[PDB]
Design a protein around this ligand. Sequence first.
Ligand SMILES: COc1ccc2c(c1)/C(=C/c1cnc[nH]1)C(=O)N2
Length: 298
Amino acid sequence: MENFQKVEKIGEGTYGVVYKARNKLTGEVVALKKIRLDTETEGVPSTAIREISLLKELNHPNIVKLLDVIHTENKLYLVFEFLHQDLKKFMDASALTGIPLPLIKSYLFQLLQGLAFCHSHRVLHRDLKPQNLLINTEGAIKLADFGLARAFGVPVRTYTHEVVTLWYRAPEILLGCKYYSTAVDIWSLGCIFAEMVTRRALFPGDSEIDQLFRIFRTLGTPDEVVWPGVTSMPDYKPSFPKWARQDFSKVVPPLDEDGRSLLSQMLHYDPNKRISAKAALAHPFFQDVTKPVPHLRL
Ligand SMILES: COc1ccc2c(c1)/C(=C/c1cnc[nH]1)C(=O)N2
């Protein structure tokens, strides 16, 4: 760790504190991740150490490279490759003009490819979000910081606790599903797809209940008709307000029909009815895909 000179704070997260560092020996710039441990009342730090190393062999052009893991003391560090910008800073710097469709489509195609990859290895991300997506000058985009089945260590008290932004969280996770599948990542990606098009978060909930109701008000309240088993779910309540379903024309304009269709299959309430990453790659929406490069101010 002392073999890395910090440059600046590159990011955050519930899992740790991301920094832009330079290898004192190599010279190459990396993205070092500080993960503090709770030696007061620790739990399965060895069960995790193995789940982290399984990520080192997870190489794909659309997945940020985990270079190496260094466990020294009360801290655990993850050395990642560095890209020049996260999709949040880019979207914000594009709120005025809007990310061109060819670029939005290129991005979705790659994300779906990398997501399709890690999925075929029974690996999920669980916490997809624009700040976790890294882009470069050459027009590529990668998925970053794959969350574990159960995070660990010690939460941040300065950044303001553990649970913060739950805008792209799937309804099954909100309804209490403890054994969720690859579908949670697709929902999240579907929410990012929409935000990139409309230039406004699809479902910007403050809390869990608000997130869930924010989804209900737009896609209508789920029932046994559209989501078999929804009412038997751990956190469902018969007293849930019953809202009407809205047209995607009103939800994601001016996305063409090809886009609204694909996004509609990504935001299906029923996890088992939700479109798979590799299935979404064959969608007609990707008929005329290309890889244009972004305009970046670094
Ligand atoms: C959140 O997790 C990660 C992991 C590896 C990373 C970055 C973020 C990351 C973010 C970032 C934001 N501005 C340039 N890079 C980076 O470059 N490499």
